[PDB]
Ligand binder design. Structure first.
Ligand code: FAD
Ligand code: FAD
Ligand code: 9E9
Ligand code: 9E9
Lengths: 340, 340
């Protein structure tokens, strides 16, 4: 049984790990390879601040809500493990700010100690008059991807720096199952009009007194098109750029100023923080995640493809659930081959 | 009108600032000098992490409850000021962990978003079954002391490195009012049996993923004789040593281990944190702060003395109220001399 996983992002590696943890014992020849064009720290996952929070509105597929909750419980149960430092995982609390009162999220009971903002708390943010406060988790991709890589390598999973041209290309060379975790660039392997790039830009500043995250929201501008501040381990992430359909992997001066004046007005103490870096990424935007199988009628036989892409701006938040779901789908494939 | 402030701690410097802010315009000859045996970073104020939290039990003097609340409001009104980073001031949330249920604190409404710990939150800490959660302030002493110094110097307040031997020594050289902010060493100038050293020891470690404070409580051992973790700007403070009557300004290997074993069992992720430093300090313990005037019938005339010491392990937490109160006592002195 030869499996080929396309994509070294959080979705590809975590999926590869789950599939191995669940079926390495029950498949004698379970050979898993990872074909990826870019590896950490050159993936969209590395640019993400890594905060756990789903979109404020309920998803078109309710399974995602379960996937988010499965991931949060998974990561939380290791927030205090000895190797939590290696995963880039830790607890963090912060504010969600609005202009007008809006309805509680569906994940109010997934995060810890969710509550409305006290009037005294809203006085520190004059431009906003309503919001929440809660404790959540940050899973920094740079560390998490490197941790996943060390586990896959010690499990015999080999890695190859290689751009896949088509699914048949992999099938022809012997792959039995193709796990498509190719993110925003998925259309190049099988055209998908629902997948589009949610371009984002962030800068990382040195502001170690920042102990809370501050996510601001403006329904007119769109989600994450508003200032936000997510303290990381070594640096503080400043963001608020969400440009749909822009394929420019290049830091734009205008967005730089947008991020700066927005966060400096939200946290005036930021004016005297040194800028450490700036990066751009593409949220794999899609009306809903595409986590499903597909029988590829290519060549003499059928190669089994399982898609996992289109996680938008919550890839780190749901990655575990999607991985477990993709592992299930892999299992169902084994039963149909009658080797389970 | 010559004033002399003995002590360059948080109380000595903040009091010297309040006195100048209020009476530099109504006293033509207001010449203030600061006599201190040690200056930053060699004072007890430097050893303290700087967290704002009063003792859990109500104070034997109900004024201090107002002083604590005044300082908090004051500091909170500058948390987003541009020079907040200069003061070492920033918001921070955290936990107070208890083995058993205990009554709420008097300051429950001073801090932001006070609440009890959710069952899920208490599952992170097996050794504790009840606790609080709230947002508070940290005023790092090393920065705050340096900030006060810059304000006082630019106001003409001259500093001198000098060990005062007696109140009469200062009065004989021309002092009109003496502001006694000499802290735990106050006894050497006027014997006080209620003032005793609450020796403490802390170590500062590099664990930038720590975003919350974790204060442990055990009534048997006594307050602050239990593990606590307070993330600062550049480092995390690990403490839990409160030894009454110990005058040894020396790091003790036994207290080192007690601090490490305690905090590592409280936060397992700490076992892989590099130890940056270790310091010993003496809380100026007293049944209640001594903030009062006293006519010293010394020499030909009476030199006015005003005491401000005995703040124990909450100096940073009340320092501002005490400075404002010592400014009032300075005013009444101005009225009595009939130059107000
Ligand atoms: C600015 C920004 C901030 C974000 N912050 C957060 C956050 O705080 N919390 C959160 O949960 N989410 C956040 N996100 C979203 C998150 O980054 C993404 O959802 C997640 O990184 C998606 O990962 P992925 O594995 O699907 O694709 P990405 O990690 O890109 O992985 C793509 C992988 O597929 C490979 N690949 C693609 N095509 C081929 C090919 N043809 N041949 C071989 N290999 C190929 C790529 O080279 C790479 O290996 C943020 C996104 C942005 C842009
Ligand atoms: C380990 C530890 C942690 C703490 N953490 C906190 C905390 O988190 N939050 C909080 O609010 N409080 C905390 N505290 C308590 C706080 O540190 C003290 O209450 C506060 O610093 C009191 O300082 P002070 O200005 O009164 O005197 P200290 O800063 O000692 O200063 C005394 C000053 O008087 C000078 N002086 C003394 N005698 C003479 C003399 N004879 N002649 C000339 N000068 C003299 C000294 O040299 C020094 O200049 C902590 C204390 C300890 C020990
Ligand atoms: O900018 C983004 O895409 C995001 C910010 C915070 C989360 Cl969570 S996603
Ligand atoms: O050890 C101490 O003296 C203190 C710890 C936390 C505050 Cl606040 S004081």
């Amino acid at each position: 049984m030869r499996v080929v996983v396309i994509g070294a992002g959080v979705i590809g590696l975590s999926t590869a790990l789950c599939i191995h943890e669940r079926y390495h014992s029950v498949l004698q020849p379970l050979d898993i390879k990872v074909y990826a064009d870019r590896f950490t720290p050159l993936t969209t996952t590395d640019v993400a601040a890594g905060l756990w929070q789903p979109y404020l509105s309920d998803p078109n597929n309710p399974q995602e809500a379960d996937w988010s909750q499965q991931t949060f419980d998974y990561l939380l149960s290791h927030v205090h493990s000895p190797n939590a430092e290696n995963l880039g995982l830790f607890l963090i609390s912060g504010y969600n700010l609005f202009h007008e009162a809006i309805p509680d999220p569906s994940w109010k009971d997934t995060v810890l100690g969710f509550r409305k903002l006290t009037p005294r708390e809203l006085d520190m943010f004059p431009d906003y008059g309503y919001g929440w406060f809660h404790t959540s988790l940050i899973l920094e991709g740079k560390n998490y991807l490197q941790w996943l890589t060390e586990r896959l390598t010690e499990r015999g999973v080999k890695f190859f720096q290689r751009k896949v041209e088509s699914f048949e290309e992999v099938a022809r060379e012997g792959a039995d199952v193709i796990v498509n975790c190719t993110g925003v660039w998925a259309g190049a392997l099988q055209r998908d009009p629902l997948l589009q790039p949610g371009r984002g830009q962030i800068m990382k500043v040195d502001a170690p007194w920042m102990k809370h995250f501050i996510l601001t929201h403006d329904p007119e501008r769109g989600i994450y098109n508003s200032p936000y501040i997510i303290p990381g381990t070594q640096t503080v992430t400043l963001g608020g750029i969400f440009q749909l359909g822009n394929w420019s992997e290049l830091n734009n001066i205008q967005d730089h100023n947008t991020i700066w004046e927005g966060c400096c007005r939200l946290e005036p103490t930021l004016k005297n923080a040194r800028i450490i870096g700036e990066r751009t990424g593409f949220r794999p935007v899609r009306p809903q995640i595409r986590l499903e199988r597909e029988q590829l009628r290519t060549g003499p036989s059928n190669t089994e493809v399982i898609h996992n892409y289109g996680h938008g701006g919550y890839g780190l938040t749901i990655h575990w659930g999607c991985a477990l779901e993709a592992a299930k789908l892999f299992g169902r494939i084994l039963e149909e081959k009658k080797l389970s």
